[PDB]
């Protein structure tokens, strides 16, 4: 009975050993992953929402059409977003209108990397390589 | 006004003799000459108005260039209170040779060193007085958002939770703040106005409050009897630069601790208190701040007050329910001690808007004096006055640190000192008694049906405005009347009252409007009815006490009251943890076990998805244990021989929590 | 469950922004925390959603702190 | 602490003990490593030594686990089980384990001593993770062996916060690194055993050093500290990013009518454009260092970080960008060491600009849009892993020629290395060929380039120049005094002494020699600007005095002769001793 | 058996006293360190003091006691104004010199909430939204 009971003590002392062991290891296991891992959590859980505005916006971000500032929410406020391709301009800008974040915007700037004031008509099929890509748009919300 | 002028005794006397000339009681501009604790309140009441005509730069500590070891210090050898007048230290050592640890502690705690060394500050963000800024750039502190526990939320939404048409959705979140949080929350001290309380009535509400605080015993204790709950807590400024409080409780022996405590009984130590932004879950977006009092004030205040503070927290069935658990049928016992001889019971509970920032300095001084009425044997009179001065210099109105900058606290309690729940309970009992007195006096008198209570009102008026000494017989009679018709239950700002309905309808005990008027003219805040409830049915208990709704359930053969929390709060605590190691879940089963303990009474609620929270937490603990065992089976080859967790996912462990046997 | 679903996404997005040290720019952190606290206190699906769009645009403008392309093919 | 296995990437916690780098190792993988090699120590979260009061049995196949400790055969408990059983070593994650056959190369990688020339071959054909491990343990073994240590002893113990130090005069001293270690060497009679693992950071006052130790034993009077073993950073990024082929231009924005000089390479800028990483190979003096600026002026809106292993190449790139790129925002990064002079004409240390100039060991952890790695001939796998881990860009550009000199590799003293085994990029450009090419000499005259167009290249390189006929070939003894273990040749600098008075057009000449000692002493003798073969790679030199000193396998290689002779843009004088190398050159015979 | 059972608790109490004495020694060594830190802090703040004006205002006093709130008001050589918006900037420290506490201060530096330098021409009515308020101007006594 004696060495059976002190054997109890051996396995429970090992319970300290194992429980401390697991807790400390998983502690900075949870620290090391989390930043990039919780970015992945943010994107998985963002994608779970399935809102066409967020979908439109981050599929435009994938192609390089990222905004240069925060998107304003009040009517008639300034947004500036860079256009990286003629196809991206063709999909979103029709006429003087600019659809983005499932919203309607009208154009104040088209402007290129040369910071040269540029006007709206020459962006076309055969004149697109002539442009200094990428272009920066300034828009207001309608 | 002259800048260097700090002694306005002649001006105070001239104002008193010009305005209150025929007020025949003696008035001491400096409260150090007062007769007793009923003369300190009176002269302080006169001073709190007489100090509103003097420049605000003439208050604060009184520094004096002393020389140590041939090198010139500049230290605070006194204080010029707005209420207690000018107080001078009895022990100043102009030519010191060796500085012991007590002397280093005192000369590092006081703001004279830092304010003298620091650069001049002009802060336009707040209307409060700004003294100095130590570092060369103002520090802006923000609050991070909470950390999402996606596993728990996914388990919840897989169990039919968080829909539209749900009575239970997330309402307690971890709100974040910008860099202007601490400075815009310290600005709420602008609501604290210099309030002159009615003195012929406060000097009787003091007697009633002391009768409420008559069962307990207290006094001074030695340094080897003071017990601290946690030693790893902070030690304020500037002591947080070198370590926690444990360093200062271990470096200082009992001898030089008692030496410091006895030094504070005949000296004033001004003290810097930090403002720390809280990282906690809440239902509204405003930043909450707590005041971090340093260790030099805290140790002496513990040695002064801990006997009474732990005597209050060890008595059951009294008015101040501190130290009484809500488990093991403690809630039921408190709630049946409330219902002790009330004629036609009705339940009432009020709310103080900006309770800790709008309190007048007079009520805090009163609370400190009522808590210091147990030192009639251990302490002398000058020792008690200097302890009150130290409390006012370390708690009430002293320099406040808000992001590397020293400001001036206009008044009100700092909510992080040694006596905050108890002093706040004294303040709440004062407001209740003042409301009762105002309701009783404001009644007509000819409409009074009971002929005794008309005589009681007559005697109340003659003991208020026609007597200068205590009438202990009438104080006992009025206290018995209050305990008979206005039974109370206080934890520091939450009161549940079982007042007489008939007397209140006639107007002979305090009602909601009486408390509103009292808070208007003695607290400089407005009490709207929108957050103060009245319960007309005694079988459902108070609407809300300590953020716990209560209800009547059946246990065994009889009926008991069980406090159930807001399920939104519990779900928010589960979903939004404040750390990354609390997100994984398998590391922390105690978190969810404690949450299930706290939210067990929801099962007995009539609404079903209120009750579903307990089963959600229980199944979550089950799944958490299952996957923890799976992980520890994968990361080893041996499965735990005594896995003792089997009782955490069946309701006996939580049902036994609210049974009065233990 | 569409409503209690955005209110957590704001929390995780603000945590990611704090991870990428938007906190060091007081001006940007201003409307970052502004939109976060306003989305937490929201009643309709709409203003929650384009405030979500505005808050995510902060992470959108960031060229090198994020790399947008990895965090969205395998998911 | 836990980790990942090397050759199977499974979760594990068994470090090997006798491996040079102390890596993480699996269960079955560790069983196979310690059952076939001489490595017997294994570090779990606790060491696998016997737990008797006095016993030293560190082999893992040899002990037994009873209770919670490790015991030997003599001190075994009645109830226990051996660690190495069923083909595995006892450790965490026992049955979540998978093995491989990569141990056949792993054993040879961890067993060799890296002085042979076949292990270097093995370290470049196996899988990626074993490549990274081999490079890491190469760097570790180099730091152990070369420039090893000087003996140090502690005179007295002042305190446990600050220590006393006494270097032995006669040997140098390595400085502070937490990566460096000084193993305790109380070696007297009397426990010649590791008493701990230490590093030393010095104080600003008196004779004191504030150490950092990993043991709880006080110092003896005879305890010593000699630096054995070193820990280099465990990089994770592969040597080469996996290739992905594009169809149209991505992430880059081309220009129309870019310039006149770069018009021949526009198709080249596309093929750089629609590939993930592209490689350029070309004989020296053909415009490899010019193609980077061509890329810059073809892709103007994109940031490009320009980086090379040395400072001379990045400085020549600085010069070419200084003449072609806009001066206003261009950058240059110097390390915190600031040991040597750099190109301080742009913004020094501005990481947020469009054209960043840096050296591989001092890059910041930032992004880019095109990265152009210059002169991979100076690049090992370690430098490639560094630039892959630190720089994170859409396009990679690898420009260089394996025919120029490889890395020093001071351990390599036996055998010969082929150009395709210098690193992974060389293995790419020599096996499957470079993507794109130029060969045409505009630097050295037709004579000397016709000489070198038979030694290293067999007649694939012509020139557009004249045979200016001042490539003087001289053959003399040049008596060699072997002073500093680096060759000094006083009579060679003497024949050069007195063959400079006869030539008035050679007073601007530059002295080149494959031995640094004679190289340095040539400064006061004759006063010309003075450079070695290794550090003169990249810059163009009008007149060159090359001086081959000895007969050996060190200075008689055709590669270093190639780079030393091809830097003379108009004329060169070469001093010599050899006869196979003199038989094939076409110089004026004297 | 009785004697050995007696000696076991003896070893227990010996270890307990050993641990208490070891902890007390470490407490003493921490006390010395915190004492040294406090002494150094106090003496450095003494070295920071402006002794001439302080001596002047103390000698002007009757008892030698002055309020603490006027020590920086009359002896501090450097002043910092924290300014929440533009109107308060125009009202308290417009220009390069301003008057507070009956003295004349010259603005040596202006920094925003992000500790970035802001030139004094940058603070305009129209250019206020582009500044990271609050502004911390730093001035010296003249
Ligand atoms: C005796 C026990 C199992 C007995 C058994 O069941 N034998 C028979 C074979 C079992 N099967 C399934 C292989 C067949 C073995 C198996 C796993 C061992 C632990 C961990 O690894 C390491 C851990 C960290 C440090 O090192 C300190 C000791 C620790 C606590 C170890 C204690 C103990 O030593 C354990 C429980
Ligand atoms: N197309 C060209 N037209 C005129 N000169 C050129 C042309 N290409 C290169 N050069 C000249 O040749 C030199 C080549 O230098 P460098 O780029 O160092 O060669 P490599 O990198 O091939 O050793 C440059 O200094 C440049 O002036
Ligand atoms: Mg070149
Ligand atoms: Zn008095
Ligand atoms: Zn007392
Ligand atoms: Zn090994
Ligand atoms: Zn393995
Ligand atoms: Zn043994």
Residues 15-54, chain C, touching B (beta carbon < 8 A): 15, 18, 23, 26, 29-30, 33-34, 36-37, 40-41
Cα–Cα separations (whole angstroms), residue B353 to B75, B126, B177, B438? 38, 20, 22, 20
Is the distance from CB of B487 to CB of B542 less than 8 angstroms?
A: no
> What whole-number distance in Å separates Cα of residue B196 and Cα of residue B216?
30
Is the distance from CB of D333 to CB of D349 less than 8 angstroms?
A: yes
- Which protein residue has the closest C-alpha to ligand 2 atom 14? D287
- Quote the distance between the C-alpha of residue D585 and its chain's center: 32
Tokens of B117: 């060394």
> Is residue D261 lining ligand 2, measured as CB closer than 6 Å?
yes
Task: For chain B, report the end-to-end CA distance as a whole number of angstroms.
Answer: 67
Query: Hunting for tokens 């939104």 — which residue is that?
Result: B568
Cα within 13 Å of Cα(A103), Cβ side: 23
Which among B62, B101, B238 has the least Cβ separation from residue E65? B62
> At residue D353, what are phi and psi to the nearest 5 degrees?
-105, 170
Tokens of B224: 């080897």
Q: How far is D367 from chain C (nearest CA, A)?
A: 6
| Chain D interface mutation, best of C62, C64, C70, C73, highest count of D Cβ atoms under 10 Å | C64
Contacts of residues B150-157 at CB distance under 8 Å and 24 or more positions apart, as own/partner, are: B150/A41, B150/A45, B150/B583, B150/C8, B151/B583, B151/B585, B152/B574, B152/B575, B152/B585, B152/B620, B153/B575, B153/C8, B155/B616, B155/B619, B155/B620, B155/B623, B156/B571, B156/B574, B156/B575, B156/B616, B157/C1, B157/C4
Catalytic residue among B417, B494, B598, B612: B494
SS3 content of chain B, % helix, strand, coil (to 5): 45, 15, 45
Q: How far is A112 from chain D (nearest CA, A)?
A: 10
- Best CA proximity match to D441, nearest among D289, D560, D284: D284
Interhelix angle D446-455/D558-565, rounded to 10 degrees, is 160
Bridge partners for B423 per DSSP: none
Say if A and C touch: at least 3 Cβ pairs within 8 Å.
Answer: yes
Query: β-strands B399-401, B273-277: how paired?
Result: parallel
Q: How far is D250 from chain C (nearest CA, A)?
A: 13
Q: C26 in contact with A at a CB cutoff of 8 Å?
A: no
Chain C's closest residue to A67, CA to CA, is: C61
Probe target for ligand 2 pocket from D290, D373, D444, with the most ligand atoms within 8 Å of CB = D290
> What whole-number distance in Å separates Cα of residue C38 and Cα of residue C27?
17
How remote is the CA of residue B382 from the centroid of ligand 5, in Å?
Answer: 11
How remote is the CA of residue D49 from the centroid of ligand 8, in Å?
Answer: 8
Total Cβ atoms within 10 A of residue D121: 14
Neighbours of chain B (3+ CB pairs under 8 A): A, C, D, E
Tokens of D23: 């890596």
Bridge partners for B560 per DSSP: B553
Q: How far is C52 from chain B (nearest CA, A)?
A: 16
Measured between beta carbons, the chain B residues lying within 8 angstroms of D96 are: 634-635
Ligand 1-lining residues (CB < 6 angstroms)? A 14, 17-18, 21; B 636-638; D 45-46, 65, 68
| Chain E interface mutation, best of B56, B65, B87, highest count of E Cβ atoms under 10 Å | B65
> What whole-number distance in Å separates Cα of residue D334 and Cα of residue B124?
44
CATH number at residue E130: 3.30.70.3540
Q: How far is D92 from chain B (nearest CA, A)?
A: 6
Please list, in sequence order, all residues whose beta carbon lies within 8 angstroms of the beta carbon of residue E86, skipping any fewer than 6 positions away. Answer: E123, E125, E128
> What whole-number distance in Å separates Cα of residue B61 and Cα of residue E71?
11
Which structural technique was applied?
cryo-EM
Q: Which helix (H) or strand (E) holds D43?
A: strand D42-43
Quick one: CA dihedral B168, B169, B170, B172, positive or negative? negative
DSSP code per residue over B136-158: SS---B-B---EE-HHHHHHHHT
| DSSP state at residue D241 | P
Would you state the torsion angle of the CA atoms of residues D374, D376, D381, D383, taken in this order, to the nearest 10 degrees? -30
Per DSSP, the three-state class of D458 is coil
Which among C1, C26, C29 has the least Cβ separation from residue B162? C1
Query: Is D29 marked as a binding-site residue?
Result: yes
Task: Count up the domains in chain C and report the number.
Answer: 1
> At residue B293, what are phi and psi to the nearest 5 degrees?
-80, 140
- Best CA proximity match to D143, nearest among D440, D349, D411: D411
Q: Which domain holds residue E123?
A: 55-141
Is the distance from CB of B115 to CB of B406 less than 8 angstroms?
A: yes
Active-site annotation holds for B528: no
Total Cβ atoms within 10 A of residue C53: 23
Is the distance from CB of B385 to CB of B31 less than 8 angstroms?
A: yes
Cα–Cα separations (whole angstroms), residue B244 to A3, B249, B578, D226? 45, 9, 22, 40
> What whole-number distance in Å separates Cα of residue D509 and Cα of residue B473?
118
- Best CA proximity match to A88, nearest among A134, A54, A142: A134
Is the distance from CB of E112 to CB of E83 less than 8 angstroms?
A: no
Q: Is C19 exposed, middle or buried (0-12, 13-18, 19+ CB in 10 A)?
A: middle
Measured between beta carbons, the chain C residues lying within 8 angstroms of A69 are: 57, 61
How remote is the CA of residue D103 from the centroid of ligand 7, in Å?
Answer: 9
Please list, in sequence order, all residues whose beta carbon lies within 8 angstroms of the beta carbon of residue E139, skipping any fewer than 6 positions away. Answer: E78, E79, E80, E81, E93, E98, E105, E106, E107, E108
Q: C56 in contact with A at a CB cutoff of 8 Å?
A: yes
Q: D351 in contact with C at a CB cutoff of 8 Å?
A: no
Q: Which helix (H) or strand (E) holds B533?
A: strand B533-535
Q: C50 in contact with A at a CB cutoff of 8 Å?
A: yes
Is the distance from CB of B214 to CB of B374 less than 8 angstroms?
A: no
Tokens of B458: 């007559």
Atom number, ligand 2, closest to the C-alpha of residue D261: 1
| 3-state SS string for D548-572 | CCCCCCCCCCHHHHHHHHCCEEEEE
Residues C25, E132, B578: CA angle, nearest 5 degrees:
40
- Which protein residue has the closest C-alpha to ligand 2 atom 8? D287
Bridge partners for B535 per DSSP: B347
Residue ranges in B181-312 assigned as alpha helix (H): 181-186, 199-212, 245-251, 254-264, 295-312
> What whole-number distance in Å separates Cα of residue B412 and Cα of residue B392?
10
Active-site annotation holds for B96: no
Cα within 13 Å of Cα(B294), Cβ side: 26
Chain C's closest residue to E112, CA to CA, is: C26
| 3-state SS string for chain A | CHHHHHHHHHHHHHHHHHHHHHHHHHHHHHHHHHHHHHHHHHHHHHHHHCCHHHHHHHHHHHHCCCECCCCCCCCCCEEEEEECCHHHHHHHEECCEEEECCEEEEEEEEECCCCCEECCCCCCCCCCCCCCCCEEEEEEEC
- Which protein residue has the closest C-alpha to ligand 1 atom 8? D81
Q: A32 in contact with D at a CB cutoff of 8 Å?
A: no
- Which protein residue has the closest C-alpha to ligand 2 atom 23? D285
Catalytic residue among B198, B351, B493, B578: B493
Q: Which domain holds residue C24?
A: 1-75
Query: Hunting for tokens 């602008």 — which residue is that?
Result: B190
**What is the tally of helices (H) and strands (E) in chain B?**
22, 20
Measured between beta carbons, the chain B residues lying within 8 angstroms of E39 are: 99, 104
- Best CA proximity match to B20, nearest among B43, B53, B52, B1: B43
> What whole-number distance in Å separates Cα of residue B295 and Cα of residue B418?
10
Is the distance from CB of D137 to CB of D21 less than 8 angstroms?
A: yes
How remote is the CA of residue C42 from the centroid of ligand 7, in Å?
Answer: 52
Total Cβ atoms within 10 A of residue D339: 8
Resolution in A: 3.3
Per DSSP, the three-state class of D440 is coil
**In this complex, do C61 and A48 lie within 8 Å of one another by their Cβ atoms?**
no
Task: Specify whether the backbone of B426 is left (phi greater than 0), alpha (psi in -120 to 50) or beta.
Answer: alpha
């Amino acid at each position: 009975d004696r060495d059976a009971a002190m054997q109890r003590k051996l396995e429970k002392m090992a319970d300290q050993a194992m429980t401390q062991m697991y807790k400390q290891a998983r502690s900075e296991d949870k620290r090391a992953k989390v930043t990039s891992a919780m970015q992945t959590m943010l994107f998985t859980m963002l994608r779970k929402l399935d809102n066409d505005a967020l979908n439109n916006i981050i599929n435009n971000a994938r192609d390089g059409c990222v905004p240069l500032n925060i998107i304003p929410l009040t009517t008639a406020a300034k947004l500036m977003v860079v256009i990286p391709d003629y196809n991206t301009y063709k999909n979103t800008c029709d006429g003087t209108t600019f659809t983005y974040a499932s919203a309607l915007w009208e154009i104040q700037q088209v402007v290129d990397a040369d910071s040269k004031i540029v006007q709206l008509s020459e962006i076309s099929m055969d004149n697109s390589p002539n442009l200094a890509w990428p272009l920066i748009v300034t828009a207001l919300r309608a | 006004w002259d800048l260097l002028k700090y002694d306005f005794t002649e001006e105070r006397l001239k104002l008193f003799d010009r305005y209150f000339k025929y007020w025949d009681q003696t008035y001491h501009p400096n409260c150090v000459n007062c007769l007793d604790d009923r003369c300190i309140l009176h002269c302080a009441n006169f001073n709190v108005l007489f100090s509103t005509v003097f420049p605000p730069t003439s208050f604060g500590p009184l520094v004096r260039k002393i020389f140590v070891d041939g090198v010139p210090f500049v230290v605070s050898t006194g204080y010029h209170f707005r209420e207690l007048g000018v107080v001078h230290n009895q022990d100043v050592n102009l030519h010191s040779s060796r500085l012991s640890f007590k002397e280093l502690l005192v000369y590092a705690a006081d703001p004279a060193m830092h304010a003298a060394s620091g650069n001049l500050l002009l802060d336009k963000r707040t209307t409060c007085f700004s003294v100095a800024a130590l570092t060369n750039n103002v520090a802006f502190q923000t609050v991070k958002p909470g950390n999402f526990n996606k596993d728990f939320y996914d388990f919840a939404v897989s169990k039919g939770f968080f829909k539209e048409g749900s009575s239970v959705e997330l309402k307690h979140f971890f709100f974040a703040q910008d860099g202007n949080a601490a400075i815009s929350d310290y600005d709420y001290y602008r609501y604290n106005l210099p309030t002159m309380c009615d003195i012929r009535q406060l000097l009787f509400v003091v007697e009633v409050v002391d009768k409420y605080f008559d069962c307990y015993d207290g006094g001074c204790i030695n340094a080897n009897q003071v017990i601290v709950n946690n030693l790893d807590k902070s030690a304020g400024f500037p002591f947080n630069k070198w370590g926690k409080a444990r360093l200062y409780y271990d470096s200082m022996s009992y001898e030089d601790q008692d030496a410091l405590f006895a030094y504070t009984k005949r000296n004033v130590i001004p003290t810097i208190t930090q403002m720390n932004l809280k990282y906690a879950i809440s239902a509204k977006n405003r930043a909450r701040t707590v005041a971090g009092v340093s260790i030099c004030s805290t140790m002496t205040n513990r040695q002064f007050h801990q006997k009474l503070l732990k005597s209050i927290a060890a008595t059951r069935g009294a008015t101040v329910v501190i130290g009484t658990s809500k488990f093991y049928g403690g809630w039921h016992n408190m709630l049946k001690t409330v219902y002790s001889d009330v004629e036609n019971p009705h339940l009432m509970g009020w709310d103080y808007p900006k309770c800790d920032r709008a309190m007048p300095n007079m009520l805090r001084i009163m609370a400190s004096l009522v808590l210091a009425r147990k030192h009639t044997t251990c302490c002398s009179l000058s020792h008690r006055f200097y302890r009150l001065a130290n409390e006012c210099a370390q708690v009430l109105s002293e320099m406040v640190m808000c992001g590397g900058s020293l400001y001036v606290k206009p008044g009100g309690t700092s909510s992080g000192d040694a006596t905050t729940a108890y002093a706040n309970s004294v303040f709440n009992i004062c407001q209740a008694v003042t409301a009762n007195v105002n309701a009783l006096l404001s009644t007509d008198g000819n409409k009074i049906a009971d002929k005794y209570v008309r005589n009681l009102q007559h005697r109340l008026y003659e003991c208020l405005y026609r007597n200068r000494d205590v009438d202990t017989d009438f104080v006992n009679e009025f206290y018995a009347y209050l305990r008979k018709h206005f039974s109370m239950m206080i934890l520091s700002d939450d009161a549940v009252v079982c007042f007489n309905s008939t007397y209140a309808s006639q107007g002979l005990v305090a009602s909601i409007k009486n408390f509103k008027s009292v808070l208007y003219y003695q607290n400089n805040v407005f009490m709207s009815e929108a957050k103060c409830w009245t319960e007309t049915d005694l079988t459902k208990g108070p609407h809300e006490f300590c953020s716990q709704h209560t209800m009547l359930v059946k246990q065994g053969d009889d009926y008991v009251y069980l406090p159930y929390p807001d399920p939104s709060r519990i779900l928010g605590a589960g979903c939004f943890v404040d750390d990354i190691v609390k997100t994984d879940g398998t590391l922390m089963i105690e978190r969810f076990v404690s949450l299930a303990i706290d939210a067990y009474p929801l099962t007995k609620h009539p609404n079903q998805e209120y009750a579903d929270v307990f089963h959600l937490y229980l199944q979550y603990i089950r799944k958490l244990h299952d996957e923890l065992t799976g992980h520890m089976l994968d990361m080893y080859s041996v499965m735990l021989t005594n896995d003792n967790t089997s009782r955490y996912w069946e309701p006996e462990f939580y049902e036994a929590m609210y049974t009065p046997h233990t | 469950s569409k409503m209690s679903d955005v209110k957590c996404t704001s929390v995780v997005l603000l945590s990611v922004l704090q991870q990428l040290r938007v906190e060091s720019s007081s001006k940007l952190w201003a409307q970052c925390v502004q939109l976060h606290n306003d989305i937490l206190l929201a009643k309709d699906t709409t203003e929650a959603f384009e405030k979500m769009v505005s808050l995510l645009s902060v992470l959108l403008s960031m060229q090198g702190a994020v790399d947008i392309n990895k965090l969205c093919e395998e998911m | 602490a836990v980790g990942a296995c090397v050759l199977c990437n499974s979760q594990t916690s068994l470090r090997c003990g006798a491996c040079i780098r102390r890596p993480f190792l699996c269960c079955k993988c560790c069983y196979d490593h310690v059952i076939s090699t001489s490595h017997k120590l294994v570090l779990s979260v606790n060491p696998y030594v016997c737990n008797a009061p006095g016993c030293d049995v560190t082999d893992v196949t040899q002990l037994y686990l009873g209770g919670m400790s490790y015991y030997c055969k003599s001190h075994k408990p009645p109830i226990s089980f051996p660690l190495c059983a069923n083909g595995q070593v006892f450790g965490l994650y026992k049955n979540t384990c998978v093995g491989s056959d990569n141990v056949t190369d792993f054993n040879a990688i961890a067993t060799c001593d890296w002085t042979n020339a076949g292990d270097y071959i093995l370290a470049n054909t196996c899988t990626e993770r074993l490549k990274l491990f081999a490079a890491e343990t190469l760097k570790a073994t180099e730091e152990t062996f070369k420039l090893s240590y000087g003996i140090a002893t502690v005179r007295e113990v002042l305190s446990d916060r600050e220590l006393h130090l006494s270097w032995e005069v006669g040997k140098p001293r390595p400085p502070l690194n937490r990566n460096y270690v000084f193993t305790g060497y109380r070696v007297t009679k009397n426990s010649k055993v590791q008493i701990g693992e230490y590093t030393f950071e010095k104080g600003d006052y008196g004779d004191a050093v504030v150490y950092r130790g990993t043991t709880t034993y006080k110092l003896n009077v005879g305890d010593y500290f000699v630096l054995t073993s070193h820990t280099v950073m465990p990089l994770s990024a592969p040597t080469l990013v996996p290739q992905e082929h594009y169809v149209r231009i991505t992430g880059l924005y081309p220009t129309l009518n870019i310039s006149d000089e770069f018009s021949s390479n526009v198709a080249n800028y596309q093929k750089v454009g629609m590939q993930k990483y592209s490689t350029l190979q070309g004989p020296p003096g053909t415009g490899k260092s010019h193609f980077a600026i061509g890329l810059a002026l073809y892709y103007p809106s994109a940031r490009i970080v320009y980086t090379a292993c040395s400072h001379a190449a990045v400085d020549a790139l600085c010069e070419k960008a200084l003449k072609y790129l806009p001066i206003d925002k261009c950058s240059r990064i110097i390390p915190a060491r600031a040991r040597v002079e750099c190109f301080d004409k742009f913004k020094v240390n501005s990481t947020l600009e469009q054209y960043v100039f840096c050296t591989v060991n001092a890059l910041p952890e930032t992004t880019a849009d095109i990265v152009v790695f210059d002169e991979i001939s100076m690049a090992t796998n370690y430098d490639l892993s560094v630039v892959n881990a630190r720089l994170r860009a859409k396009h990679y550009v690898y420009i260089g020629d394996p025919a120029q000199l490889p890395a020093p590799r001071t351990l390599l003293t036996k055998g010969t290395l082929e150009p395709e085994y210098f690193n992974s990029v060389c293995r790419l450009m020599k096996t499957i060929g470079p993507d794109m090419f130029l060969g045409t000499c505009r630097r050295c005259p037709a004579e000397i380039v016709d000489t070198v167009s038979a030694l290293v290249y067999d007649n694939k390189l012509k020139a557009h120049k004249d045979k200016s006929a001042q490539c003087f070939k001289m053959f003399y003894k040049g008596v060699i005094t072997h002073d500093v273990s680096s060759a000094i040749n006083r009579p060679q600098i003497g024949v050069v002494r007195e063959f400079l008075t006869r030539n008035p057009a050679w007073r601007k000449a530059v002295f080149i020699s494959p031995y640094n000692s004679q190289n340095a002493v040539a400064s006061k003798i004759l006063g010309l600007p003075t450079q070695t073969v290794d550090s003169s790679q990249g810059s163009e030199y009008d007149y060159v005095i090359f001086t081959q000193t000895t007969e050996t396998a060190h200075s008689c290689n055709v590669n270093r002769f190639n780079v030393a002779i091809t830097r003379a843009k108009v004329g060169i004088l070469c001093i010599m001793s050899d006869r196979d190398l003199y038989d094939k050159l076409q110089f004026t015979s004297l």
